[PDB]
């Protein structure tokens, strides 16, 4: 009735084989008593790194060990512990006199790859899914608190990006905006995991357009739209010159984190956002150096 090779044909198996299981590990593994072992055929110490697996040799096999009940917690090593720490990811200037952002408003492209500390931590993984708490610390360049009213407005991609301090877009009829005085504590708000992909992608080895991919367009390599969440716009609410030079610092605290595929930690200084470029002539060693392998 059927052709057999069709009946076995495991084609269409949606579930993955696994091979490993997650076990509880609230504390560090304890050490159990070890005694001398003088025998043939059993060699813990001997390994074959070629295989690609880490040595499974235990302390007990390398020395006579006592017993230790390790109750040291592993809680602080979870992704949430490691990442749920507010950090600077954006800085916006709103000076009186200047070439940066006069007029009294700015449009910050939402991109956390602009600051080294936070960037390196996340670039530890290839994919990350999470919600976040954005906190906005505003004041003058001197760090002085001033009686000024601001309006922050999240502008999802495709929404009208404000062209002036009095842009019609500030009616923010559907966009979420925040109105705060610099005298009020820094504004903080909760953001979900928005993105058509299942996770944000720190590294996207590919292009996003499907074209010819000539010289001029090599600007698009590594540009993944599933990460461009839109822009964050800010203006001093009014129709006249601010009167005070402002600055807004954007801090982000990740929460409800999931991360996948760990990568080697950043090695060379960062140069540009969403672009692993490094300084070819200043390629420094991962760390410190000595004078000889036989001396400290």
């Amino acid at each position: 009735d059927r052709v057999a090779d069709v009946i076995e044909s495991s084609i269409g198996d949606s579930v993955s084989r696994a091979l490993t299981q997650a076990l509880p590990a609230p504390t560090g593994q304890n050490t159990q008593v070890s005694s001398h072992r003088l025998d043939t055929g059993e060699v813990p110490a001997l390994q074959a790194a070629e295989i690609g697996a880490s040595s499974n040799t235990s302390d007990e096999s390398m020395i006579e060990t006592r017993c230790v009940l390790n109750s040291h917690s592993t809680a602080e090593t979870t992704l949430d512990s490691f990442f749920s720490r507010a950090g600077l990811v954006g800085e916006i200037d709103l000076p009186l006199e200047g070439t940066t952002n006069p007029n009294g408003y700015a449009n910050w492209d939402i991109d956390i790859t602009g600051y080294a500390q936070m960037r390196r931590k996340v670039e530890l993984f290839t994919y990350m899914r999470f919600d976040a708490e954005f906190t906005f610390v505003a004041c003058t360049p001197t760090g002085q608190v001033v009686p000024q009213l601001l309006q922050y407005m999240f502008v999802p991609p495709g929404a009208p990006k404000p062209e002036s301090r009095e842009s019609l877009a500030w009616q923010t009829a559907t966009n979420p905006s925040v109105f705060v005085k610099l005298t009020d504590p820094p504004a903080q708000v909760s953001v979900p995991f928005m993105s058509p992909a299942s996770a944000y992608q720190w590294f996207y080895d590919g292009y996003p357009t499907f074209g010819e991919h000539k010289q001029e367009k090599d600007l698009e390599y590594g540009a993944c739209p599933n990460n461009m969440m839109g822009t964050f716009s800010v203006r001093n609410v009014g129709s006249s010159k601010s009167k005070y030079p402002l600055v807004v610092r954007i801090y982000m605290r990740m929460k409800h984190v999931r991360a996948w595929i760990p990568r080697p930690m950043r090695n060379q200084n960062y140069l540009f956002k969403a672009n692993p470029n490094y300084a070819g002539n200043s390629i420094k060693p991962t760390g410190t150096s000595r004078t000889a392998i036989t001396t400290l």
């Binding site: 949606s14 292009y207 357009t209 080697p264 692993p276 470029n277």
Partner: protein, 245 residues
């Protein structure tokens, strides 16, 4: 019963008498896309044997000075075989891979290659040396296809990342005194159930000499490295005409 092995997919069989076990990337065998993990509503093609088989793509010559090479994956197999076709004809592609890198020598030669799989292997540039110029790697460097591409600054994997730590990736070594081939099975890894085999390369294969090749003169000086690989659970959807890139 561990240094010898036989890999058989489609109408291809690889053999080896000096293997070093098999690595299964992130401990997961390639599977097909769940009925609830998917979005594309059209019923896909699963050519099976005509695509899931071993393609021996290329040979490189290992020399006492070699820096190391890499191949971006989804890409590498396009233009080649029935796999390549389904990839050009369809928008969406999905699949795992069995990568078998081989290189042998005599018990009198010595050297060690690091064979690793680095997901989303984004390439960088030297930034014009001074690092003031915002240069970008060309389509020729980011997606070399077969023939692969040679590294210029392996220490940082041409991307500002320490190769010393590349081992947190499904890897395996080819130490001549010990073995003569690496075998890594990689599952489909992406943030989407399917993606375009053309503009996206789920991962890159790195083959780098960490302990240089060496031998006394008189012993055959031509030590090649050959890359053989096979797609697994290949699935395609989004049929249209054939697109190259």
């Amino acid at each position: 019963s561990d240094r010898v092995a036989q890999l058989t997919i489609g109408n291809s069989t690889i053999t080896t008498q000096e293997a070093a076990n098999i690595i299964v990337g992130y401990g997961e065998w390639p599977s097909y896309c769940s009925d609830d993990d998917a979005t594309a509503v059209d019923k896909p093609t699963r050519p099976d044997v005509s695509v899931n088989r071993f393609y021996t793509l290329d040979t490189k010559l290992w020399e006492k000075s070699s820096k190391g090479w890499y191949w971006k994956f989804p890409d590498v197999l396009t233009e080649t075989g029935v796999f390549g076709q389904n990839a050009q004809f369809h928008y969406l592609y999905r699949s795992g891979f069995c990568i078998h890198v081989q290189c042998n020598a005599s018990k009198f030669h010595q050297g060690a290659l690091l064979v690793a799989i680095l997901p989303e292997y984004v390439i960088g540039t030297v930034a014009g040396g001074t690092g003031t110029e915002d240069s970008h790697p060309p389509y020729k460097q980011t997606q070399p296809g077969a023939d692969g591409f040679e590294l210029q600054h392996p220490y940082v994997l041409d991307a500002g990342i320490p190769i010393s730590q590349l081992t947190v990736c499904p890897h395996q070594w080819i130490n001549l005194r010990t073995n003569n081939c690496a075998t890594i099975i990689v599952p489909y890894m992406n943030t989407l159930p399917f993606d375009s085999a053309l503009n996206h390369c789920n991962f890159g294969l790195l083959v780098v000499p960490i302990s240089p090749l060496d031998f006394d003169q008189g012993a055959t000086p031509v030590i090649p490295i050959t890359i053989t690989l096979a797609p697994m659970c290949s699935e395609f959807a989004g049929l249209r005409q054939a697109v190259t890139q």
